[PDB]
Structure 1
Amino acid sequence: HHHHMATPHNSAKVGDFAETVLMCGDPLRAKLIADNYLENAKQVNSVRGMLGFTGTYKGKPLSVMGHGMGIPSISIYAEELYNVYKVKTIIRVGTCGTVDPNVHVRDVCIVTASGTDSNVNRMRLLGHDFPATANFEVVSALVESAKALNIPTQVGKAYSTDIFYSKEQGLNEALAQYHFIAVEMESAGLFPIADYYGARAGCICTVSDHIITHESATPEERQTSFQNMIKIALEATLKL
């Protein structure tokens, strides 16, 4: 039985997303967030398995949805959310690697801006350097929420790469030299889309892996890190 599609990639009806949305790469993690932290929750997207849900957190409307892997994937989903679904604030909630010697596995990283090896931002600004920059109120809400929860955080730059399986000599050394704290694949695509729509975005990630030492969080450590990060993000939404 055919259903009307408000976008090519999302089964939700217009209005079915809250103005504030958390997004993570793995749709199964979106379901875990909804099941464990949202009330009044309903599934609003099933297309491509990219599960999305709308409910409330402490009474305030909040949605959560997967975004898939990479800049092109998050760009589709976020463009649609801001444009068709009229979302105002997206916080990406993710995992990351690090090269910074002072950032450790299990650390929580709040992203102020994200570099990239993608061409998508050059294309938006006449070939020039367009910093993918988080909204300050979002960053501050995340920082303040972690402080109130007594959870330490690292605040600074991420790097969003198109290539998970890097073969690039000298990259890690440059990222470390300039104190990039988080290596991931999506945030640099999100922030300029928020800008286009006059909207807001941020990102918070937990360090799953040290790219230099190959230290890696166990499943139990990843659950603890997730619980800390998601509580920070959820509490931050109450201020946004």
Structure 2
Amino acid sequence: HHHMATPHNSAKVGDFAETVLMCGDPLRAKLIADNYLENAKQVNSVRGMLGFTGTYKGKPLSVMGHGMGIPSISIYAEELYNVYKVKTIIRVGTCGTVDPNVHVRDVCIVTASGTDSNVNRMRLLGHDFPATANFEVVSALVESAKALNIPTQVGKAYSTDIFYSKEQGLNEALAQYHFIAVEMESAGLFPIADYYGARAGCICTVSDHIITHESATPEERQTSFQNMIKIALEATLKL
């Protein structure tokens, strides 16, 4: 038995750095810790949602899984900002795209995210509350990619509750308004950062084109991940 600082995290207060990268898959969090962090230790294993704390180029940094969907990331991020006193969370993920000018393997830096969830209407008296990335975080990601000579797409994501969409006309509307990324979490993260006076952003790589049906191979996904994660890690040095 260990004291539980939250119902979903066994880390002691202080065991997370002020900057955290989060990805959906806890096994990918372990891969990030093993391959890019030094001084690394596992700080959470509750529910299999592995989290780690170490350093990247000497600067404290944590990485943890967030699971799939807005409710799951909301639990973990609320706890990180509130109990663990985290200041900056960058979601690092994969996405689909419907935009005609976005291609598989593209790196997408998210400025704001739409959604079919009710969680943000519930925060703003039923009105439209844009889930908006922090500008310093977006800029750090953009500048890091420029310095690494990695092209990026910058723009809106759409976070859906339903991976297996049956909704006619959705893809066409997303394309008409130039949404660049379709994923499941970022629209839940940004308003929680706002509540705590903290910062968040998101960077994703395109695994699939929803309209053309092009899809990245496993080797292509590894290369895209290596590009994206280097951008995110270098960005943490500016944050």
1:165-187 alpha-carbon deviations (Å, 9 max, x no partner): 00000000000000000000000
- CA positional deviation for 1:132: 0.1
**TM-score normalised according to structure 2 size:** 1.00
Cα distance in 1 for partners of 2:125, 2:228 equals 36
Cα distance in 2 for partners of 1:101, 1:229 equals 21
1:72-108 alpha-carbon deviations (Å, 9 max, x no partner): 0000000000000000000000000000000000000
Cα distance in 2 for partners of 1:8, 1:230 equals 29
Amino-acid identity (%)? 100
> Aligned with 2:6: secondary structure?
coil
Unaligned 5+ runs, structure 2: none
Alignment of 1:106-121 (within 5 A): 106-121=105-120
- CA positional deviation for 1:214: 1.2
Cα distance in 2 for partners of 1:80, 1:3 equals 18
- CA positional deviation for 1:46: 0.2
After the TM superposition, list the runs of 4 or more consecutive aligned residues in structure 1 that deviate by more than 4 angstroms: none
Cα distance in 1 for partners of 2:37, 2:213 equals 34
> Aligned with 2:39: secondary structure?
strand
- CA positional deviation for 1:56: 0.1
Task: Tell me the number of residue pairs that the alignment of Structure 1 and Structure 2 aligns.
Answer: 239
- CA positional deviation for 1:213: 1.3
- CA positional deviation for 1:191: 0.1
1:180-211 alpha-carbon deviations (Å, 9 max, x no partner): 00000000000000000000000000000000
1:213-238 alpha-carbon deviations (Å, 9 max, x no partner): 11110000000000000000000000
Q: Match for residue 5 of structure 1? A: 4
- CA positional deviation for 1:8: 0.1
1:126-145 alpha-carbon deviations (Å, 9 max, x no partner): 00000000000000000000
Cα distance in 2 for partners of 1:239, 1:80 equals 24
- CA positional deviation for 1:52: 0.1
**TM-score normalised according to structure 1 size:** 0.99
Unaligned 5+ runs, structure 1: none
- CA positional deviation for 1:18: 0.1
Q: Match for residue 41 of structure 1? A: 40
RMSD of the alignment, in Å?
0.2
Cα distance in 1 for partners of 2:34, 2:100 equals 36
Determine whether 1:190 maps to 2:178.
Answer: no
> Aligned with 1:120: secondary structure?
coil
